[PDB]
Amino acid sequence: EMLKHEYVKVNGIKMHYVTQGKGKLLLLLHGFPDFWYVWRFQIPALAKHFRVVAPDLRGYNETDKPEGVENYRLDLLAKDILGLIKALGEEHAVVVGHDWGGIISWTLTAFNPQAVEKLVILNAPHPKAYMTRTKNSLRQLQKSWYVFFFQVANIPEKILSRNEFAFLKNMLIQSFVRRDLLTEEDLRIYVDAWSKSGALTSALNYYRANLNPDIIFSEKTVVFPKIKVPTLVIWGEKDVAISKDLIVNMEDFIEAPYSIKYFPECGHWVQLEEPELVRKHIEEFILKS
Amino acid sequence: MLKHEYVKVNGIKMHYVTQGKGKLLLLLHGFPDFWYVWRFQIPALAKHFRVVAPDLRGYNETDKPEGVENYRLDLLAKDILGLIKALGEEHAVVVGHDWGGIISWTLTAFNPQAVEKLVILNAPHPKAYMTRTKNSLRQLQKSWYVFFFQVANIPEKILSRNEFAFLKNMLIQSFVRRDLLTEEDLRIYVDAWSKSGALTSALNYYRANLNPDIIFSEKTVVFPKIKVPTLVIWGEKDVAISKDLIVNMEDFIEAPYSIKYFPECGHWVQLEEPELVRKHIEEFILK
Ligand SMILES: C=C(C)[C@@H]1CC[C@]2(C)O[C@@H]2C1
Ligand SMILES: C=C(C)[C@@H]1CC[C@]2(C)O[C@@H]2C1
Ligand SMILES: C=C(C)[C@@H]1CC[C@]2(C)O[C@@H]2C1
Ligand SMILES: C=C(C)[C@@H]1CC[C@]2(C)O[C@@H]2C1
Ligand SMILES: [Cl-]
Ligand SMILES: [Cl-]
Ligand SMILES: [Cl-]
Ligand SMILES: [Cl-]
Numbered sequence A: 001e002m003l004k005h006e007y008v009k010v011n012g013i014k015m016h017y018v019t020q021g022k023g024k025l026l027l028l029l030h031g032f033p034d035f036w037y038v039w040r041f042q043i044p045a046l047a048k049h050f051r052v053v054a055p056d057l058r059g060y061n062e063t064d065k066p067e068g069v070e071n072y073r074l075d076l077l078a079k080d081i082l083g084l085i086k087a088l089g090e091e092h093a094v095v096v097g098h099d100w101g102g103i104i105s106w107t108l109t110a111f112n113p114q115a116v117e118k119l120v121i122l123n124a125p126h127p128k129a130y131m132t133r134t135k136n137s138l139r140q141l142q143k144s145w146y147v148f149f150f151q152v153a154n155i156p157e158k159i160l161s162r163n164e165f166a167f168l169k170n171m172l173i174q175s176f177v178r179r180d181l182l183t184e185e186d187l188r189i190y191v192d193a194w195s196k197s198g199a200l201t202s203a204l205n206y207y208r209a210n211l212n213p214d215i216i217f218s219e220k221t222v223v224f225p226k227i228k229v230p231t232l233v234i235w236g237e238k239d240v241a242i243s244k245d246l247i248v249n250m251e252d253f254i255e256a257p258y259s260i261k262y263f264p265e266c267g268h269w270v271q272l273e274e275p276e277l278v279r280k281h282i283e284e285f286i287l288k289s
Numbered sequence B: 001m002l003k004h005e006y007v008k009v010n011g012i013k014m015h016y017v018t019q020g021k022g023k024l025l026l027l028l029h030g031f032p033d034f035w036y037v038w039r040f041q042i043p044a045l046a047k048h049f050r051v052v053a054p055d056l057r058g059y060n061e062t063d064k065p066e067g068v069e070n071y072r073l074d075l076l077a078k079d080i081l082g083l084i085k086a087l088g089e090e091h092a093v094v095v096g097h098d099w100g101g102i103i104s105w106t107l108t109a110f111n112p113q114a115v116e117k118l119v120i121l122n123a124p125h126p127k128a129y130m131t132r133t134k135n136s137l138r139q140l141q142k143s144w145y146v147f148f149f150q151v152a153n154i155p156e157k158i159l160s161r162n163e164f165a166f167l168k169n170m171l172i173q174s175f176v177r178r179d180l181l182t183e184e185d186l187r188i189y190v191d192a193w194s195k196s197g198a199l200t201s202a203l204n205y206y207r208a209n210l211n212p213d214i215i216f217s218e219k220t221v222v223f224p225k226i227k228v229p230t231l232v233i234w235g236e237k238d239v240a241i242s243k244d245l246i247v248n249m250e251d252f253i254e255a256p257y258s259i260k261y262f263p264e265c266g267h268w269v270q271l272e273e274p275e276l277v278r279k280h281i282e283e284f285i286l287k
Helices: A074-087 A100-111 A127-136 A138-143 A145-149 A155-175 A184-194 A199-210 A275-287 B042-046 B073-086 B099-110 B126-135 B137-142 B144-148 B154-172 B183-194 B198-209 B274-285
Strands: A004-010 A013-020 A025-029 A051-055 A093-098 A116-122 A231-236 A258-263 B003-009 B012-019 B024-028 B050-054 B092-097 B115-121 B230-235 B257-262
Touching: A004 A074, A013 A074, A025 A074, A025 A100, A074 A100, A074 A199, A093 A100, A100 A116, A100 A127, A116 A275, A127 A138, A138 B137, A138 B144, A145 B137, A145 B144, A155 A184, A155 A199, A184 A199, A231 A275, A258 A275, B003 B073, B012 B042, B012 B073, B024 B042, B024 B073, B024 B099, B042 B050, B042 B274, B073 B099, B073 B198, B092 B099, B099 B115, B099 B126, B115 B274, B126 B137, B154 B183, B154 B198, B183 B198, B230 B274, B257 B274
Parallel strands: A025 A051, A025 A093, A093 A116, A116 A231, A231 A258, B024 B050, B024 B092, B092 B115, B115 B230, B230 B257
Antiparallel strands: A004 A013, A013 A051, B003 B012, B012 B050
16 A cells, blocks of 8 residues: 545545545544644554545645635535545545544534544534634633634734744644654645645635634524534643633534543644554544444 | 813823822823723822823723824823823823833833833833733733734624623623622723724724734834833733733833732732722832
């Protein structure tokens, strides 16, 4: 087996992905400020049992980057993944999502349960949990200072990209509980992906479209179907972006059986900090029902 | 007793309350307050001084020019310099809380001749916040709302809806005493917040002086040292300001300086320990 790079048209966007292995379709979905490469430690080990597919989401790295904030609404992002499953000649997939990848995964599974065999979430709060609780959590509103910063046009792009993405590199390094987690080669690979024309604006449009102050402080109740697919939630407790207030009491959101695996000595990038334990928990969940 | 007055300063009409006679003593409020934040200090300080508590540009009964550019710190300090002159004085003892304190630091640094003594209550030195915020995760987190306030119209709508419920809650959460504000106090605050254009004007202070360009500026700040006797009163349980921004204030002051820490107080130290605050201010001026 060897890691192959492919491109496929889904809805109206050309999506890039890396793939390795054969068997059940296993999707690995990254978040901000990542791309398929965040899954580097899981792809070869998982490919021993599955047909592993790690795509670049809409607006990231090698995938198409439509213009406009409205093109980054969660509904369209979940439809890209649904479209990806179909384009890969499958009816369903095991879906693993981290950060934005996780928010998209929760959305895909709630609105299209038939397309998701099993759901794996890594440090990604349930959309109804964040929509309901953020406005009522001072600690969460504080952790989300940058979500408000990202609302502003052009200025965050400028601040984040200047001096070879120094601000972005620093904010990333500060989020890790592990020392020197990114090598100089890793940083050079991330800077290449970050530098793709229109990538940063597109990545920031996820916050502008789905996490603007109107949505955060909405008085309207959220229409979100219960999760009806077996779910595994992995949570690195030392998360600098997400409060525990947003992960507790998932009972009212998940009807199907579910499990929560807490990593008390890990942060937001649990798949980078404990790559083998994360890979093992994912494998065991799928292969042992 | 307490008298309400209006006076022309620069190109704006400024409202203020005044009580007492003697040395001119200015009390400057911040966000989301007005002269009324000084209710517990005005009658006691009037006993020895000519107390003047104005409503800053854009607040309550004072003129509210339209546009973000009309709320730059340079213009706000010039309003106070102008207010000193309009009251028939050369100088004043300046006491500033929050934005009032930021204005006071600015007035004292660029016009020392207009300030007899300085009193700062939970207001970081402008050079301290401009330099240190971008380097303090804890401060950037505490300042989530500064970023929220950058957005047009949406913060005004969220803050004012349901009779300013969001504003009332964020204010109550900032106090170290659960039932500090009475139902009457809250209706007095809602009246001042409801003044036509008041909320937008108050939010324009953040848009003009604390936008992301300023916070993450690579350029160093030109700010003269404080050459006037300075007293700093600080409530340590401040939800808006990290201690990182208040440490090493001596490197900004080339004059007598003293700092009184209130470990069991928050941002509204003048409301939480009104007598102790009044006493520290009185003792500093009269000695
Ligand atoms: C807790 C949050 C507001 C955020 C939601 C969006 C993102 C990418 O998943 C992180 C945490
Ligand atoms: C660039 C940033 C301000 C953010 C900081 C927090 C988080 C979760 O790590 C991302 C990038
Ligand atoms: C410390 C901060 C970034 C701000 C500065 C402005 C104000 C009124 O004092 C509050 C908090
Ligand atoms: C209403 C708000 C968002 C803020 C919350 C924090 C602070 C210092 O109390 C002010 C008002
Ligand atoms: Cl690539
Ligand atoms: Cl752990
Ligand atoms: Cl009044
Ligand atoms: Cl105290």
